[model samples]
Structures are given as C-alpha cells and as structure tokens.
Target: ETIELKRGSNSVYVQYDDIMFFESSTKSHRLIAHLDNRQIEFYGNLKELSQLDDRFFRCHNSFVVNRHNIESIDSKERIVYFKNKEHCYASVRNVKK
Candidate 1:
C-alpha cells in the first residue's frame, strides 16, 4: 500500500512497506520517514502522520514505528529494532505496556 503526503505544491508518494519508521526531526518542525536506503523529511507531526495507518505505533514521543517492520523489542534497553536494522527507543511506559 502507499500514501501521498503534500510537499508544498507537489505530492510525495511513499509506499507503506518501504517505510521502516518515522521520526521527529531534531532541528525542525518536521517528520523524517526512514526507508531501507534513504529518508525523506516532510513538514508534519509524528502524531498526525501516524494517523495514516493502523500499522504505525507510537513507540516514543519522537518516533512512530511501523509495527510490521519491527524485528524485535528490547524491553531492557527500551529499544525497537526494525527489519532494516535501524532502531528507535520506546518510552519506559510503553515498554511496560
């Protein structure tokens, strides 16, 4: 499946299966979509972007991970490892849940 996001006057199409996860950009009010080989930045909030799919889970305040892409969850480290080998941290509260 795929979804389209607006980038100014142009539309950016991203395949759901190609996405490993989405993270909040540290330096801007934008979201970064991480793919297998690259990442794309789009102006949006993680919360809002996550609403696009049920497979997306808010692992942390700064990350919304695709559950389908998750390889494992390390509760001890509060980290979520993806099939792409990229990882992100989940909140302690989320880990407990």
Candidate 2:
C-alpha cells in the first residue's frame, strides 16, 4: 500500500510496508517516518494517520507503528523491534493488544 504525507507545500509518497514506524519529531507538528532504509520528516497528525489506515497503530503518544513491519515485542519493556533491527515502544494500553 502507498501512503502520502504533506512535506511543506509538496506531498511525499512511500510504501506502507517499507515504513517501520513514525515518531513525533523534536518540534511540534512534525513527524519522522522510520523506514527500512531511510527516515523521512514531514508535517502530519499522528492520530489522524493512525485512523486513516488499518496497518498503522498508534502504539504510544509519540509512536505509531506499522504492524506489517513489526518483528517482535518486548512485552515487559513495551518495546517493538523491526526486521531492520530498529526499536520503538508501545504504550501501556496498546502493548496489551
């Protein structure tokens, strides 16, 4: 599946399966898209993105993961690992699911 995000005045598209997760950037109104080979920065609402697609789960307030790319979960630590060896976390509530 392909998803599009607004980057400044332009729109950027990426394959859904290629993205491992998305995290809120250091500043407001920005998100970093973690992919298999690259990271992308763009402007988008994390909550909105989660609701927009079934593959995206808002694992935590600052983290939204693509279920398709998740390799495993550290249940105790609420951490999620990808096939690429990247790690991210889930919220207390979401991790239970």
Candidate 3:
C-alpha cells in the first residue's frame, strides 16, 4: 500500500515499504522515507490510517512508528516503546492486538 496526500491540489505518494519513520504534530504529520534523505511533513493527521499501512504502527499519538526500524519494545509502561537510545514512546491504546 501507499500513502497519498493532496496539498492544495498537488498530490504526493509514498510507498509503505519505503517509509523509515512517522511523526505526528498538532497540525500535521511528518513522514521520513528511505528516499530523498529528508523527512516530509504532510498537513493531515495520520492516525486515521494506522491500520491501512502494514508497516505503520502507532507508537504514540504524536508518533506513528515504522515497524521496520523498530529495534525493541518496552511493555513495562504499557507503551510499545522503541529501544533506540533516544527512547521513542508508543501508546498501549495503539498496541492492542
């Protein structure tokens, strides 16, 4: 599957398999993919599409993580936190099986 966005009439497309990270902001969502060597921020909320993208998983309401880049998970806080030294947080609300 792919992620599609229309910005004031300009449409953008990114394949799910190429994504590296996803970060959500109050007004938009940013997607970091393998190509272009930079993060692309879109003007819509990505949480609505969590289930559609097989590689997309909600690690936090403010962060929809790409499972391919996940190195670890922490369950002690009911958070599917990432093992990166930076420590990323995923909500239990989104980890439900």
lDDT of 2 at 23: 96
Q: Among these predicted structures, which one has the highest TM-score?
A: 2
Answer with 1 or 2, whichever has the higher lDDT. 2
Query: Can you write out model 2's per-residue Cα lDDT over 13-95, one digit (the tens) per residue?
Result: 99888889999999789999998888999998799889968989999999999888889999998899998899998888889
Clashes of 2: 0
Between prediction 2 and prediction 3, which has the larger TM-score?
Answer: 2
Rank by TM-score, descending?
2, 1, 3
User: What is the lDDT for 1 in model 2?
Assistant: 69
Tens digits of per-residue lDDT for model 3, 1-97: 6777545557678876555556654453443333225455566665665777667776666666667656566666654433343345667666553
TM-score: model 2 vs. ground truth: 0.92
67 in model 3: Cα distance from truth in Å? Answer: 1.0
Runs of candidate 1 exceeding 4 Å displacement: none
Candidate 3: regions farther than 4 A off: 26-36, 73-87, 92-97
Top-scoring candidate (lDDT): 2
